[PDB]
Design a protein around this ligand. Structure first.
Ligand SMILES: CC(C)(COP(=O)(O)OP(=O)(O)OC[C@H]1O[C@@H](n2cnc3c(N)ncnc32)[C@H](O)[C@@H]1OP(=O)(O)O)[C@@H](O)C(=O)NCCC(=O)NCCSC(=O)C1=CCCCC1
Ligand SMILES: CC(C)(COP(=O)(O)OP(=O)(O)OC[C@H]1O[C@@H](n2cnc3c(N)ncnc32)[C@H](O)[C@@H]1OP(=O)(O)O)[C@@H](O)C(=O)NCCC(=O)NCCSC(=O)C1=CCCCC1
Ligand SMILES: CC(C)(COP(=O)(O)OP(=O)(O)OC[C@H]1O[C@@H](n2cnc3c(N)ncnc32)[C@H](O)[C@@H]1OP(=O)(O)O)[C@@H](O)C(=O)NCCC(=O)NCCSC(=O)C1=CCCCC1
Ligand SMILES: CC(C)(COP(=O)(O)OP(=O)(O)OC[C@H]1O[C@@H](n2cnc3c(N)ncnc32)[C@H](O)[C@@H]1OP(=O)(O)O)[C@@H](O)C(=O)NCCC(=O)NCCSC(=O)C1=CCCCC1
Ligand SMILES: Cc1cc2nc3c(=O)[nH]c(=O)nc-3n(C[C@H](O)[C@H](O)[C@H](O)COP(=O)(O)OP(=O)(O)OC[C@H]3O[C@@H](n4cnc5c(N)ncnc54)[C@H](O)[C@@H]3O)c2cc1C
Ligand SMILES: Cc1cc2nc3c(=O)[nH]c(=O)nc-3n(C[C@H](O)[C@H](O)[C@H](O)COP(=O)(O)OP(=O)(O)OC[C@H]3O[C@@H](n4cnc5c(N)ncnc54)[C@H](O)[C@@H]3O)c2cc1C
Ligand SMILES: Cc1cc2nc3c(=O)[nH]c(=O)nc-3n(C[C@H](O)[C@H](O)[C@H](O)COP(=O)(O)OP(=O)(O)OC[C@H]3O[C@@H](n4cnc5c(N)ncnc54)[C@H](O)[C@@H]3O)c2cc1C
Ligand SMILES: Cc1cc2nc3c(=O)[nH]c(=O)nc-3n(C[C@H](O)[C@H](O)[C@H](O)COP(=O)(O)OP(=O)(O)OC[C@H]3O[C@@H](n4cnc5c(N)ncnc54)[C@H](O)[C@@H]3O)c2cc1C
Lengths: 378, 378, 378, 378
C-alpha cells in the first residue's frame, strides 16, 4: 500500500506534469533547452532530490516513490524525467559508499530547496558496455589524488556542482582497482568538451569531460581504494529501475495520445476505434505497458526492501520497459497516421526519446546478459 | 498479502505437483488418460473444488488462490491443471446466478471430499467465437424444459455429473434470449458423441454432447429466462484468468527444463549456459513468464475484489500468458536441441499443450477485441 | 537479366549516390533543404524522369530500373529517393490515363534535361486511408471545371509545375464519381498552405493545397469523368513498389553503418563483431533486408510484365520492406550504442526516415488489408 | 529460367503430392510409418535420387530442382519430404569427395529405379552443434579401418544400405583429424539402437548407431584422411537449403488449409475471411512464406552456380524458412480455432513437423552464427 505522504507527493507530481511540464515539452525538445523551469519548480516542491536522506535535509522517499514520479513525468516529458534520473544517480554513490564525513561535507548542500546539480561520470570513449576498460587514472600524491582522463555522454556533466568520477587507482587489479571520487565544479583541471546533439531527449545536457592533472582532496574518495567498481555496479542496479520507470511513462504517454486519436479520428464513416485492427494494436500496446509497469514496480519494491532478487527483476524491468517504449511509441506514431509523423503532435518526439531508453543505463544486450547470468548461475 | 491458509494450501499443492503429478504427466499424455488419480487425491486434500462456497461445504478460497494452484499444476501437467479449470468453470454459473433453492439442490453434492464432476456446455459447431449463433433450444412444456441441440469441445462433458447447458429460450431476442440450465448425468435424451483426439492436453476428455428431446425439471433453470448470455459472459471473465494462470505454469515448467538443460549440456567445452545467445534466450523467456505472472495475479486480485477493471486485466493476462506459453515452450524445445523434440523429455508435450491456451476460453483474437473495446470505449 | 543500358544507369546511380548524394544527406536533414543540387544533377544525367515515355522525350526505363535506383538512393538519402518517387508518381496518372492530346500537351515539358516538377494530390484532412471520403469537388461550367477543396501531405505540392488533382465530379456515384485533373502552377485559385515539419525525410516539401474557385480547362481532365478512382488505385499499386524499394535502401544503408561499426568498435578486448549476440543481430537484419529486396524486385518485374499478381506482390513488398526498414534502422542505432543516438552518425536520421515508409503510399494496415483481400477473395 | 525437363518433373511431383502423398499423410504420422509406398513410387518415377550424377545412372537435376520438389512434398507431408532430404544428403559426401573408384563402386547401385537407401551419420550424444566433439574413431589396421563409436538422430540410419560415417582418424588434429567412410548395411560390428519417438515428422526413422570393432575396407574412405570435416561442412551448406525448401513447403501447406478454412467457416453471419484481423493474419503468413521461398530459390540457384555466396544465402534461407514454418503453422492452427487443435485436420501435425526444421541441419542459433560470421568477417 502507498503511504499518505507517497499519495500526496504523487497527486502533486501528476498535477505538475499535466499543468506545467506537458505544455513545455514541445519547446524543450524544439529548442534543446535544459529544463530550468522544472528544475527550479521541483526544488521548491521538494521533488528534485527524492532519495536525499533525512539526515542531510532530504525527503528520503525511496525507490518505489521515485519510480512512480518518473512514470508520471515520462508520460509528458522524457527529458524532464531524465533530469530527476541524473540528479538522483549523481548522489547515490555518495549516499551508498561515502564515509559519514564525506556525506556531511557534500550532501548538506542539496538540503531542502537547493537547486544544485549532480552527475555520474563512468562512461568513456574506450569504455561503454565494457566499463572495466575505462582509462581515467587517479594517482595519490600527498594530500591529493591527481586525476587524468576523459568521460563522455555525462548527463548534466557540464552543469553539475558535484560529479562522481570513476577512475583506476590500480590498473593491474581490474575490477578491484577502480575508485570513486567527488569532483566539484570549479576544480582546476576539470575541462568541458562538447554538448552532443542527439536524436531525442533533447531537453538535456550530455557532456564530454576532460581531467588534465586535476587535483582533488584525498578526503574526496568515496569508500576505500578499489571499491569503486562495486559502488558503480550497485548504482547501476538502481538506475536501471529508474530507466524502466521513465520508459513505462514514455510508453503510457504515447498510448494515451494514440487512444484519444482513435476516438476522434473518423475514417470509413466512424471513429477508427471501431476498426478491429486498431483495437488489436491498442490491446497489444496497453498490455505491454501494463506488464512493463508491474515488472518495474516489483523491481523498485525489491530495491527498497534490500532484496538480492532486485538485480534480476530490475534487469528484466529495464529490458522490457524500454523495448515496450520503443515498440509502443513506434505504433503510436502509426496510429496517428500522417499526423503522427508531424512534430506538432508529440508522439514522434516520444518515439525519438524512447530509443535512448534501450541504450543508456546499460544497453538491452548488457541487461539481457545480466538477466541470463543471474538465472543460469544463481 | 497471502493468508496462512493460502500459504499452507500452496505449499501442499507444490509438494503434490512435484511428488505425484509430475511423474504421471508423461504417461497421462502418452496413453490419453483422464487424471483419475489426481482427481481422487485432490478431492481428499480439498483441492478439487476451491471456489465452492463455505455455505455448501466448500473451501471458498477465491480466484487468486486458484490462480496460484493452476500455475503450480500447469508447471508439471497442463491436463491436470485443466481438470481444475473445467471443475470450477462448471459450477461458477450456479454459484453466480442460481437461486438459493437451486444452489442447495446442486452444490451440496460437491461438499468436502466429493469426487463428482462438473462441465460447462456453451460451444457448438455453429457457435465458437460467435456464441450468440448457438442453435440448442429449450422449450417450456408444463413443469419441464425440453432441450434439443448439440455441443462440442465440452471438457469432461461425457463424465460430468452436473452440466451447465446454455440454450435459446427465445431465438428472436439474441443476447436476451439465452438461458442456462442444470443438466444431470443420466437424464434421458442426453447423448454422448465422440471424445476428440487433440494435439495436446491429451490427459483430458473433450466431448460432443447431443440433446434429443431431453426433459429437464423447470426448476433446473439458472436465474431468469433470457439472463443466460450475461451468466455465460461473467463465467468467461473468470475462466480467462484460469487459462492465464495455467499458461503461466506451462511457460514456467518449460523454462525450468530449459534452464536445467543449459547447466548440464556441454558443447564447445563448457555447459551451453556459458554461451551469450543461450543467456539471451533464457532472459527473454523468464522476463515474459514474470510479466505474464504479474498480469495474471493482478487480474485474479481484481476479480476477488469485485472490481470492474477485472475484465480488462483478465483479457490482457489471458492473451499475454498464452502467447508467452506458446513462445516459451517453442524456445524451450529449441534450447534442448534434438533432445527437445523427443517425447521422453516433456518439453515437446508442453509445447503441444501451450497451443490450446491461445484458443480455448476464447481465442486470443477475441480476447484482443475484448481488451481493445474496453480501452477505447470505457 | 539486366540490359546493358540498365547496368550503365545503375553503375552511374551508385557512383552519384556515393560521391554526391551521401556527403549532402546530413545537411539536407539538418537544414530541411529541398535537394536542389540532386534535382539539377539528376536532370542532366537523365535520372529525374526514368518512366517518362520515349515518345515525349523520356528514357522509359521501366519499374524494375526505378526500383533499383531507389534502393541505391535510399541507402544514402531517403529524402533524395523521395524526390524521384514524387516525380514519377506525379506523371504516372497522365502516362496511364491521359488522351494522346493531354499527354503531348503536358508530358513534352518534362523531355530531356527538364527540371520541372510534378506532384500527385489525392489525400485530404478528411481522406487519408479512406480516399473515397475526399471532399474536393470539380464542377463542369462551360469550357472549364471549377475546383473547390483542399489537399494535405502533398510531396512537392507547392513547387510542382504540374499537379494531378483528384476530385469528385459526382459525389453520389462514390468509387465511380471521382475524376483526375492536370492543374498547372500559376492557376488562379490554387493556394499554398503550410510546409509541414516532420520527424524525418526533412529534405523534402510536404504541402497543404487549397482550391478556391480554381478554374481549369475542361481539356485538362485525365480520362473520362468517373474513372479517377481506378486511375488513382493503379498509380498506388506502382508507387507502393517505389516505397518498398526506398525502404529496402534505407534498411541496407543502416545495416552497412552497423556492420562497419562492429568491425571497428572494440569492447571486451576485441571488435564487437566477435560477440555472438552482435552476429545474431546483424544476421537477422541482413536476412530481413535480403527478403524485402527479393519481394520488391519480384513486385517490380510483375508491374513491368503487366501481370495481375503485381497488386498482391507489391502490397507484400511494401509492408515487409517498410517494417524491415523500421526494425533494421532501430537495431542499427542499437548496434552503434550511444554513438548511434548522435546526429553526426546518420543512423538516427535513417531511423526517423524509416518510420514514414510504414505510413505513406498507404499505411501498413491498409496494405495488409489489400494483401489479405487479394489472398482470400481472388 | 526453368528447363522443360524441370517443368515436367515439377508438374509430375505436384500431381503425385496431391493424389498420392497428401491422402497418406494422416496415417503416416498416426502410425509412425516409414513412407514405403512413396519411396517405391519415387524410385519408379525417377524422383528418389535427383542429385545422382548422369555418370552413375542418375537424373542429375541439381539443387534448384530438388528445392522445388521439396517445397511441393513439404506442402502435404513433411516426413515424405524428409525421405528425399535424407536420401540426397546420404550420397552428397560420396558425389563430392569420393575417388572415381569409390564413386563407381557405391553410386552405381542407386542408378535408375533402385530403391536402396542412404544415410549420413555425423551427430553423436556428445556432438550436436559442436561436431568437432565427436568421439567415433577410425583406426587403420592393414587393409581395413576399425571403427568404434556411436551416432544418434541418424535419419534412415537403421534402414540405409550405404551410410556415410564421420570419425576421427587423428583426435589431436581437430578439424584436420576427421575422415569420412562408406559403411554398408550388414557390416559386422554395425549395431542398431533405438528408433526415437519424436514430436513430429513421425513418418520417419531416426536411429542410434553403434560401431563395435566395425571393420571397413581401407578403400571405403571418402577422400584423404583428415578431409572429413571439410566434406561434412560442404554437405551441410547444401543440406540447409533442403531444410529451407521443406520448411517453405510446410508453411505453404499450413497457409493453404488456413485460407480454405477462412472461406468456409462462418461466424458473425459471414465467412471469417471477411474479418479484418483474419485478413491481417493471412497477409502476414503469406508474406513470410513468399519471402522464405524467394530466399530459398536464390540460395539453391547460387549452389548450382558454385557461387561462394551460397553459404551466406543458404544460412539466411534455412533460418527464415524454418522460423516462418514455425510461425505460420502456429497461426494456421490458430485460424482453424478449436478444429485446428484436432488431429483429423492436419495443421496440428504441420505445426509439430515445423518445429524440427528449426533444429536439424544445424539449429537456427548455429545458422545465425554462420550468417553473422559470413557478414562480419567476409
Ligand atoms: C555487466 C558488465 C558488462 C561487467 O561485466 P564483465 O563481464 O566485464 O565483468 P564481471 O566478470 O561479470 O564482473 C566483474 C566484477 O564485478 C562484480 N559485479 C558484477 N555485478 C555486480 C553487482 N551488481 N554488485 C557488485 N559487484 C558486481 C563481479 O562479481 C565481479 O567481481 P568478481 O571477479 O566476481 O570478484 C558491466 O561493465 C556493465 O554493467 N556495463 C554496462 C554499462 C552501463 O550500465 N553504463 C551505465 C552508465 S550510467 C547511465 O548510462 C546513465 C546515468 C544517468 C542518466 C541516465 C544514464
Ligand atoms: C465477445 C463475444 C464475441 C460477444 O461479442 P459480440 O460482438 O457478439 O456481442 P456484443 O454486442 O459485444 O455483446 C452482446 C451482449 O453481451 C453483453 N456482454 C458482453 N460482455 C459482457 C460481460 N462481460 N458481462 C455481461 N454482459 C456482457 C453486451 O453488453 C451485450 O448486451 P447489450 O446489447 O449491450 O445489452 C463473445 O461471444 C465471446 O466472448 N466469444 C468467445 C467464445 C468463448 O470465450 N468461449 C469459451 C467457452 S468455455 C472454454 O473454452 C473452456 C471452458 C472450461 C475448460 C477450458 C475451456
Ligand atoms: C484500399 C482502399 C482503402 C479502398 O478500399 P475501400 O474499402 O474503401 O473500397 P473498395 O470497396 O475495396 O474499392 C472501391 C472500388 O475501387 C476499386 N478498386 C480497388 N482497388 C483497385 C485497383 N488496384 N485498381 C482498380 N480498381 C480498384 C474496387 O474494385 C471498387 O470498385 P467496385 O465497387 O468493385 O466496382 C483505398 O482508399 C486505399 O488504397 N487507401 C490508402 C490510401 C493511400 O494509399 N494513399 C496514398 C497517397 S499517395 C503517397 O502517399 C505518396 C505519393 C508520392 C510521395 C510518396 C507518398
Ligand atoms: C559451425 C560449426 C559449429 C563449426 O564451428 P566451430 O566454431 O566449431 O569451428 P570453426 O573454427 O568455425 O571451423 C573449424 C574449421 O572448419 C572449417 N569450415 C567451417 N565451415 C566450412 C565450410 N562451409 N566449408 C569448408 N570448411 C569449413 C573452418 O574454416 C575451420 O578450418 P580452419 O581452422 O580455418 O582451417 C559446425 O560444427 C556446425 O555446422 N554445427 C551444426 C551441426 C549441424 O549442422 N549438424 C547437421 C547434421 S545433418 C542433419 O541434421 C540432417 C541430415 C539429413 C536429414 C535432415 C537432418
Ligand atoms: C544520452 C546518453 C546519456 C547517458 N548518460 C550517462 C551518464 O550520465 N553517465 C555515464 O557514465 N554514462 C552515460 N551514458 C552511457 C551509456 O550507458 C552507454 O552509452 C552504454 O553503456 C553503451 O555504451 P557505448 O555507447 O560505448 O556502446 P558499446 O558498448 O560500444 O556497444 C555497441 C553495441 O555493442 C553491444 N555490446 C557491447 N558489449 C556487448 C556484450 N558483452 N554482449 C552483447 N552485446 C554487446 C551493445 O549492446 C551495443 O549494441 C549515456 C549515454 C547516452 C548516449
Ligand atoms: C480442447 C478444447 C476445450 C475447450 N473446452 C470448452 C468447454 O469446456 N466448454 C465450451 O463451451 N467450450 C469449450 N472450448 C471451445 C472454445 O472456446 C473454442 O473453440 C473457441 O471459442 C474458438 O471457437 P471455434 O473453435 O469455433 O473457432 P472459430 O470461432 O471458428 O474461430 C476461427 C478463427 O477465426 C477467428 N475469429 C473468430 N471470430 C473473430 C472476430 N470477431 N475477430 C477476429 N477474429 C475472429 C478466431 O480467433 C480463430 O482464429 C474448448 C475448445 C477446445 C478445442
Ligand atoms: C510526409 C508524407 C508524404 C506523403 N505524400 C503524399 C502525396 O504526395 N500525395 C498524397 O495524396 N498523399 C500523400 N501522403 C498521404 C498518406 O498516404 C497518408 O497519410 C496515409 O494514407 C494515411 O492517411 P492518414 O494520415 O489520414 O491516416 P488515417 O487514415 O487517419 O489512419 C490512422 C490510423 O488508422 C489506421 N486505419 C485507417 N483505416 C484503416 C482500416 N480500414 N483498417 C485498419 N486500420 C486502418 C491507419 O493504418 C493508421 O494507423 C503523404 C503523407 C505524409 C505524412
Ligand atoms: C529428428 C532429427 C533428425 C536429424 N537427422 C540427422 C542425421 O540424419 N544425421 C546427423 O548426423 N544428424 C542429424 N540430426 C542432428 C541435428 O543436426 C542436431 O540435433 C542439431 O545439430 C543440434 O544438436 P543437439 O541436439 O546436440 O543440440 P545442442 O548442440 O546440445 O544444442 C542445444 C541448444 O544450444 C544451442 N547452441 C549450441 N551451440 C551453440 C552456439 N555455439 N551458439 C549459440 N547457441 C548454441 C543450440 O542452438 C540449442 O538451442 C537430426 C536431429 C533430429 C532431432
Amino acid at each position: 500500500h502507498l503511504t499518505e505522504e507517497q499519495k500526496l507527493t504523487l497527486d502533486m507530481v501528476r498535477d505538475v506534469a499535466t499543468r506545467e511540464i506537458a505544455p513545455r515539452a514541445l519547446e524543450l525538445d524544439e529548442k534543446s533547452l535544459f529544463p530550468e523551469y522544472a528544475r527550479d519548480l521541483f526544488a521548491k516542491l521538494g521533488l528534485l532530490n527524492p532519495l536525499l536522506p533525512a539526515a542531510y535535509g532530504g525527503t528520503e522517499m525511496g525507490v518505489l516513490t521515485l519510480a512512480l514520479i518518473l512514470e508520471e513525468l515520462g508520460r509528458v516529458c522524457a527529458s524532464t524525467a531524465l533530469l530527476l534520473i541524473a540528479q538522483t544517480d549523481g548522489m547515490l554513490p555518495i549516499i551508498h559508499g561515502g564515509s559519514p564525513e564525506l556525506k556531511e561535507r557534500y550532501l548538506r548542500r542539496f538540503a531542502g530547496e537547493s537547486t544544485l546539480l549532480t552527475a555520474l561520470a563512468a562512461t568513456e570513449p574506450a569504455a561503454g558496455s565494457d566499463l572495466l576498460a575505462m582509462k581515467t587514472r587517479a594517482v595519490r600524491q600527498g594530500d591529493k589524488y591527481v586525476i587524468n582522463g576523459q568521460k563522455c555522454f555525462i548527463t548534466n556533466g557540464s552543469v553539475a556542482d558535484v560529479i562522481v568520477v570513476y577512475a583506476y587507482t590500480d590498473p593491474e587489479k581490474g575490477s578491484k582497482g577502480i575508485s570513486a571520487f567527488v569532483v566539484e565544479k570549479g576544480t582546476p583541471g576539470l575541462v568541458y568538451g562538447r554538448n552532443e546533439s542527439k536524436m531525442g531527449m533533447r531537453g538535456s545536457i550530455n557532456s564530454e569531460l576532460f581531467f588534465e592533472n586535476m587535483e582533488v582532496p584525498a578526503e574526496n574518495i568515496i569508500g576505500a581504494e578499489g571499491t569503486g567498481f562495486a559502488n558503480l555496479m550497485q548504482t547501476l542496479s538502481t538506475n536501471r529501475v529508474f530507466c524502466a520507470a521513465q520508459a513505462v511513462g514514455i510508453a503510457q504517454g504515447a498510448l494515451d495520445i494514440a487512444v484519444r486519436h482513435t476516438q476522434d479520428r473518423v475514417q470509413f464513416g466512424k471513429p477508427i476505434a471501431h476498426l478491429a485492427p486498431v483495437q488489436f494494436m491498442v490491446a497489444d500496446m496497453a498490455t505491454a505497458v501494463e506488464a512493463s509497469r508491474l515488472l518495474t514496480r516489483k523491481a523498485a519494491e525489491l530495491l527498497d526492501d534490500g532484496d538480492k532478487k532486485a538485480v534480476l527483476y530490475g534487469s528484466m524491468a529495464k529490458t522490457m520497459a524500454s523495448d515496450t517504449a520503443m515498440r509502443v511509441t513506434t505504433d503510436a506514431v502509426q496510429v496517428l497516421g500522417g499526423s503522427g509523423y508531424m512534430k506538432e503532435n508529440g508522439v514522434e518526439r516520444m518515439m525519438r526519446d524512447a530509443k535512448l531508453t534501450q541504450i543508456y543505463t546499460g544497453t538491452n544486450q548488457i541487461t539481457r546478459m545480466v538477466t541470463g547470468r543471474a538465472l543460469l548461475f544463481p
